[PDB]
C-alpha cells in the first residue's frame, strides 16, 4: 500500500516507447503538486530520474521524459534499452493532512525479447574445515541464466535427495541475467559414505548436472 498507484509491472519491446503511469487524487497530484520519479536498479538505492514533472537530472538519458495531467503522471521511455530494466517509483506531495511526501508502489520494467541464457553452474564440495567441525554443506552456484526461473535438484549418487535443501529465489544480476544459490546440508558421514553427490539445474527444458566426490 502507498498513496499513489502504479502498475506493478510494465513490459516493452526493444527500441519502442513505453509508459509507466502514476495516479493519485485531488489531494496530491490533482492538487497541483509536482511529480518526481526514481529509478532503482536491483540491490541499489533509488536515484533521482525525473524531477518537477519533466526535468531530467544530468546523467539521465534523454530517452526518459515525464509529464503530468490532472490526477496522474506518466514516465515515458523511448528507444527502450535492456539497461532500462529496473524498478521505477513516482513521488509527490499530499496536502490533505499536514503535508506528506507520498510514493507510488513501484513498477518493474521488463524489456522483452532478451535471448535465453543457459545457466553456468559451479558446485563446491564440503570444505575439510567444515567436515572437521562435524558439518557438511554442498554449494551449487547458478549464474547468467535467462529467463529467471530454474529448478535445482540434488542427488546422492543417482538418487534424488529431498531433505536438507535450501535454495534462493532467482535474483537479477547487473547484466539483466539471473543468479541463484542452492545448499545441501549433510552429515560428514553421509558425505563420506556415498560415491558422489550431484547438483542438477533445470532451465527452459535443458539440464546441467555437476557432480562432486569425497
Amino acid at each position: 500500500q502507498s498513496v499513489l498507484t502504479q502498475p506493478p509491472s510494465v513490459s516493452g519491446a526493444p527500441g519502442q516507447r513505453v509508459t509507466i503511469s502514476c495516479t493519485g487524487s485531488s489531494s496530491n497530484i490533482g492538487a497541483g503538486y509536482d511529480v518526481h520519479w526514481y529509478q532503482q536498479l536491483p540491490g541499489t538505492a533509488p536515484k533521482l530520474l525525473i524531477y518537477g514533472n519533466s526535468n531530467r537530472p544530468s546523467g539521465v538519458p534523454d530517452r526518459f521524459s515525464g509529464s503530468k495531467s490532472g490526477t496522474s503522471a506518466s514516465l515515458a521511455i523511448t528507444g527502450l534499452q535492456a539497461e532500462d530494466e529496473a524498478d521505477y517509483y513516482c513521488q509527490s506531495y499530499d496536502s490533505s493532512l499536514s503535508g506528506d511526501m507520498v510514493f507510488g508502489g513501484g513498477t518493474k520494467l521488463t524489456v522483452l525479447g532478451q535471448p535465453k541464457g543457459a545457466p553456468s553452474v559451479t558446485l563446491f564440495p564440503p570444505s575439510s574445515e567444515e567436515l572437521q567441525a562435524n558439518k557438511a554443506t554442498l554449494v551449487c552456484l547458478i549464474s547468467d541464466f535467462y529467463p529467471g526461473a530454474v529448478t535445482v535438484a540434488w542427488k546422492a549418487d543417482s538418487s534424488p535427495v529431498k531433505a536438507g535443501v535450501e535454495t534462493t529465489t532467482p535474483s537479477k544480476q547487473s547484466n539483466n541475467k539471473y543468479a541463484a544459490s542452492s545448499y545441501l546440508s549433510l552429515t560428514p558421514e553421509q558425505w563420506k559414505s556415498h560415491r558422489s553427490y550431484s547438483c542438477q539445474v533445470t532451465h527452459e527444458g535443458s539440464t546441467v548436472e555437476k557432480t562432486v566426490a569425497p
Binding site: 524531477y51 513521488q91 534462493t168
Partner: protein, 225 residues
C-alpha cells in the same frame, strides 16, 4: 557531491526503539535551505517516507508513523538521526537517509536527491549470530580456459547483511557475491566466488574478508588449493 551515510544497529527487538544516524559530508546540514529526510523500503516492497527535519529543528513526519517517529539533528557533527519506537516486524526495512532542497515545505515542490546508501534493520526477537566462514577451494571445471573458481561459504549468521571483499578490496575482477538464502533455522548463508587465473594458484594468495557488522565479527579466510 553532497553525500549521506546511514549507520546504526541492524537488529531491534519487537516493542523496542530503532535508532539510526545519518552522517552528511560534502555539504552542510546547518544553514542550508534543505530538509534532511528518512525513507524506508521493506524487503521486496516499495518506498515510504518517514519524515524530514530542517537544521534548526522543525520537522514534518509521515502521518501514518508520526506517533512513533522522532527525528533530530546535530549540526555540530553534520548528522541527523531517527528514532522509531514500539517496532514490529512491519518495520523491518532498508532505511535510507536523503535530502530535499526546499524553498517552502508546503509548496510541495521538493524531491529526494541525493540519497544515502541504505542500511538494513531487522526487527526480531532472535539473537545475533556471527557467521562461520569456510573456504571453497579452487575448481577449474566450470570456468573459462585457464581460470578457476574459488570462494567463501559464509554460513549461519543473523541478521543480514554480511559484506564480502577479496584481498582487502584489492581483488575486484571476477568477484560474484550471491544473495543469501534464509534457512528454516532462521539463519542466513551466502557464498562469494571469484574466478582467477589457474596458472598462478600457487603464487598468489586469495583471502575473503567477511564483515558481519550486527555481530561485530570480521573473518579474513585464506582460500588455498
Amino acid at each position: 557531491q553532497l553525500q549521506l551515510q546511514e549507520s546504526g544497529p541492524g537488529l531491534v527487538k519487537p516493542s523496542e526503539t530503532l535508532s539510526l544516524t545519518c552522517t552528511v559530508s560534502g555539504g552542510s546540514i546547518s544553514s542550508s535551505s534543505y530538509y534532511w529526510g528518512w525513507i524506508r523500503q521493506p524487503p521486496g516492497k516499495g518506498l515510504e517516507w518517514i519524515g524530514s527535519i530542517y537544521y534548526s529543528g522543525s520537522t514534518y513526519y509521515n502521518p501514518s508513523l508520526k506517533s512513533r517517529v522522532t527525528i533530530s539533528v546535530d549540526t555540530s557533527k553534520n548528522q541527523f538521526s531517527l528514532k522509531l519506537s514500539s517496532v514490529t516486524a512491519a518495520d523491518t526495512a532498508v532505511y535510507y537517509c536523503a535530502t530535499s532542497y526546499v524553498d517552502n515545505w508546503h509548496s510541495g515542490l521538493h524531491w529526494f536527491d541525493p540519497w544515502g546508501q541504505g542500511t538494513l534493520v531487522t526487527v526480531s526477537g532472535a539473537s545475533t549470530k556471527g557467521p562461520s566462514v569456510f573456504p571453497l577451494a579452487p575448481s577449474s571445471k566450470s570456468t573459462s580456459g585457464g581460470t578457476a573458481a574459488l570462494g567463501c561459504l559464509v554460513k549461519d549468521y543473523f541478521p543480514e547483511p554480511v559484506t564480502v571483499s577479496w584481498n582487502s578490496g584489492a581483488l575486484t575482477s571476477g568477484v560474484h557475491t550471491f544473495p543469501a538464502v534464509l534457512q528454516s533455522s532462521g539463519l542466513y548463508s551466502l557464498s562469494s566466488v571469484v574466478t582467477v587465473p589457474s596458472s598462478s594458484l600457487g603464487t598468489q594468495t586469495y583471502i575473503c574478508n567477511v564483515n558481519h557488522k550486527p555481530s561485530n565479527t570480521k573473518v579474513d579466510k585464506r582460500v588455498e588449493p
